[PDB]
Amino acid sequence: MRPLPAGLTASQQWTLLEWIHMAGHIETENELKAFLDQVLSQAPSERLLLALGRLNNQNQIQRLERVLNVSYPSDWLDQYMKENYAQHDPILRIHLGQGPVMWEERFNRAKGAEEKRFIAEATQNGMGSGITFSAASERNNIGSILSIAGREPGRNAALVAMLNCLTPHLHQAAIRVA
Amino acid sequence: MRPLPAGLTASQQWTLLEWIHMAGHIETENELKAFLDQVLSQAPSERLLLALGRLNNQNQIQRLERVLNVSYPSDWLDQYMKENYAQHDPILRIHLGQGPVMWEERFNRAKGAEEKRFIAEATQNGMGSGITFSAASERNNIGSILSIAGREPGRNAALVAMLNCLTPHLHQAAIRVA
Numbered sequence: 465m466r467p468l469p470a471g472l473t474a475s476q477q478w479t480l481l482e483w484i485h486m487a488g489h490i491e492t493e494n495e496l497k498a499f500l501d502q503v504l505s506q507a508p509s510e511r512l513l514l515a516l517g518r519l520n521n522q523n524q525i526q527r528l529e530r531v532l533n534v535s536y537p538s539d540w541l542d543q544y545m546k547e548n549y550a551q552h553d554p555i556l557r558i559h560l561g562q563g564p565v566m567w568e569e570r571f572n573r574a575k576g577a578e579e580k581r582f583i584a585e586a587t588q589n590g591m592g593s594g595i596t597f598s599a600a601s602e603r604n605n606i607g608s609i610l611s612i613a614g615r616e617p618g619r620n621a622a623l624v625a626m627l628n629c630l631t632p633h634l635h636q637a638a639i640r641v642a
Numbered sequence: 643m644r645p646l647p648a649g650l651t652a653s654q655q656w657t658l659l660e661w662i663h664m665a666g667h668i669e670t671e672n673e674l675k676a677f678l679d680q681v682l683s684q685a686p687s688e689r690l691l692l693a694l695g696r697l698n699n700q701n702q703i704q705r706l707e708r709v710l711n712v713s714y715p716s717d718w719l720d721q722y723m724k725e726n727y728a729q730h731d732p733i734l735r736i737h738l739g740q741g742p743v744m745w746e747e748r749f750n751r752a753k754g755a756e757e758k759r760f761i762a763e764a765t766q767n768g769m770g771s772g773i774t775f776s777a778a779s780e781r782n783n784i785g786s787i788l789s790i791a792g793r794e795p796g797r798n799a800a801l802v803a804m805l806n807c808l809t810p811h812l813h814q815a816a817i818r819v820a
């Protein structure tokens with residue numbers, strides 16, 4: 465269990481309390497979508513996506529089970545699927561539950577030609593910067609990623625900590641919904 | 643979704659935040675038991691029990707699926723089962739998810755001879771006063787009750803509100819564990 469954040473204002477603590485309280489009541493994809501819209505309206509980004517996947521023995525996604533696009537541009541998602549970017553996207557190689565991953569840091573490390581190509585294309589599409597939070601369950605070999613695109617989220621330490629703490633509850637909700 | 647309490651101190655808000663955060667990480671009966679011990683240590687009672695049941699069309703328990711005794715006296719539980727009190731205990735007739743139920747208020751209304759007998763015996767066993775919180779899921783026709791025996795819990799408005807808000811998350815955890 466990841467520890468709750470220190471240093472939140474009373475308003476931020478209350479927001480996080482409401483978020484986790486609400487998350488625990490989510491039963492349907494309708495509700496899950498509506499909740500993520502609510503969370504979205506609180507972050508310095510307009511681009512959010514949640515995905516559920518089956519994991520390998522190193523807690524990496526080996527099969528995407530469910531993708532809930534909240535506000536990624538549909539044309540980017542179409543391209544991602546059409547050009548099979550799942551195979552080259554460094555973000556899909558994260559070891560889930562190992563902490564928040566800043567995209568720029570991860571992208572700057574990419575070695576392969578195909579990965580560099582993807583990064584170039586993501587960058588052109590406004591997806592060059594962002595953060596991915598994650599949670600994983602041993603119970604059933606399943607994990608979730610919550611991705612938010614943009615530079616500003618990562619620069620708000622409080623928001624990062626809040627979203628990170630919310631992520632395992634979004635994971636439980638996503639399992640219920642699936 | 644039941645609303646979060648108003649009027650909690652910052653310490654109480656933090657306790658509730660920790661409780662719901664922890665509850666969302668519970669996967670095993672071991673963990674569920676340990677968590678309830680933790681919650682117990684914060685309330686003016688020493689007697690707590692959680693139960694999961696299948697519900698009728700009025701959200702009442704029709705079949706007990708799982709009983710997690712945290713600190714009810716084992717001799718009382720033995721008697722309850724041996725004398726088939728489940729059939730006469732006014733608390734098992736609550737409409738789950740309809741708000742916290744104070745036992746003394748409910749007991750004072752009992753009409754039947756068998757119910758009065760039960761109440762008399764419960765009272766002799768230190769179980770005459772208490773509160774039961776509840777949650778119900780339409781998804782799978784299942785509900786949970788969280789019972790705490792004693793007079794003092796009910797007299798702490800903050801604790802009541804906190805435990806009430808925790809209850810739906812304990813319900814989700816209990817379903818996962820079952």
Ligand SMILES: CCCCCCCC(=O)N[C@H]1CCOC1=O
Nearest residue numbers: 531541544553555556586591611
């Ligand atoms: C169709 C499923 C797409 C899932 C993408 C999940 C990981 C992620 O958010 N990748 C970022 C990394 C840069 O561009 C992206 O789309």
Ligand SMILES: CCCCCCCC(=O)N[C@H]1CCOC1=O
Nearest residue numbers: 709719722731733734764769789
């Ligand atoms: C063996 C299962 C017993 C479940 C009892 C759940 C309801 C409850 O807490 N009843 C209180 C009411 C007074 O005495 C009791 O035991």
